[PDB]
Swiss-Prot record:
UniProt record similarity statement: Belongs to the EspG family.
Name the UniProt record assigns to this protein: ESX-3 secretion-associated protein EspG3
Mutant phenotype after disruption: Deletion of the gene impairs iron-bound mycobactin utilization and EsxG and EsxH export.
Chief localization: cytoplasm
Keyword Cytoplasm in record: yes
Pfam families: ESX-1_EspG
Organism: Mycolicibacterium smegmatis (strain ATCC 700084 / mc(2)155) (Mycobacterium smegmatis)
InterPro entries in the cross-refs: EspG (IPR025734)
Keyword Cytoplasm: yes
Keywords: Chaperone, Cytoplasm
Length: 257
């Protein structure tokens, strides 16, 4: 579209190199692929990404630069079935917002006007299964315990052991089972910023999980002693937008709004 462009993973790297904006963030996992630099410039000039003068489109460039030199961002790790590498990133530099989304060996840079929290919800849930919000009473557990429990699931540990580790009561047992269900599709959201000569990233992220019970949101809250608490709640659009808004607020720069 007018404020969006689709590229290949190699074409993205090449553009980032000729502009000298630095390397892409690790979350996108852009791997290095002049028997190549000039070889693809025939495809870029064809697509109008670069003019016949070998100069990059003024703001296609600005988007790459925003993504590479971002002052505020959200790392998006989507997870489907194995063999899928869907990564995403919400980037802010100065005032413009840029959404980088990598699927397989394709990448889409999109400029967005994000004045609202809810404006992000479609992007965050893009790599999911489109489940409706689940219905249940909120419950909380140590964020460190939940992260450990999830690491054990991916390492092949039986479900029953993981539930005993967390000390899940029967009330929420059917519900935690759905969270760690193998037929799930989820996304982990991490916030970060650049300020005062520091790189500050969040310690605990926000998870949106599409389960057999429905869409579930997991958002953290810090206690006084510094230890985090993970709250499980129905993943409605308002809850998601709230969680991401609160996640960014935990950083020095404060909320994005």
């Amino acid at each position: 579209g007018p404020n969006a462009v689709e590229l290949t993973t190699d074409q993205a790297w090449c553009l980032a190199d000729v502009l000298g904006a630095g390397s892409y963030p690790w979350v996108l996992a852009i791997t290095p692929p002049s028997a190549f630099l000039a070889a693809q410039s025939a495809e870029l000039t064809r697509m109008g990404v670069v003019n016949s003068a070998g100069a990059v489109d003024p703001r296609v460039a600005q988007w790459i630069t925003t993504v590479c030199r971002a002052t505020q961002w959200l790392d998006l790790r989507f997870v489907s079935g194995p063999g899928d590498l869907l990564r995403g990133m919400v980037a802010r530099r100065s005032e413009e917002t840029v959404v980088a989304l990598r699927n397989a060996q394709l990448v889409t840079f999109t400029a967005m006007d994000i004045g609202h929290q809810h404006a992000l919800v479609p992007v965050l849930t893009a790599g999911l299964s489109g489940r409706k919000p689940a219905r249940f009473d909120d419950f909380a557990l140590p964020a460190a315990a939940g992260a450990r429990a999830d690491e054990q699931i991916r390492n092949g540990a039986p479900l029953a052991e993981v539930l005993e580790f967390l000390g899940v009561p029967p009330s929420a047992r059917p519900l935690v089972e759905s969270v760690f269900d193998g037929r799930r599709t989820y996304v982990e959201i991490v916030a970060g910023e650049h300020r005062d000569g520091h790189r500050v990233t969040t310690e605990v992220g926000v998870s949106i999980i599409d389960t057999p019970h429905g869409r579930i949101l997991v958002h953290p809250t810090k206690a006084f002693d510094g230890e985090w608490i993970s709250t499980f709640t129905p993943g409605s659009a308002d809850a998601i937008a709230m969680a991401v808004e609160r996640l960014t607020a935990s950083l020095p720069s404060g909320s994005w709004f």
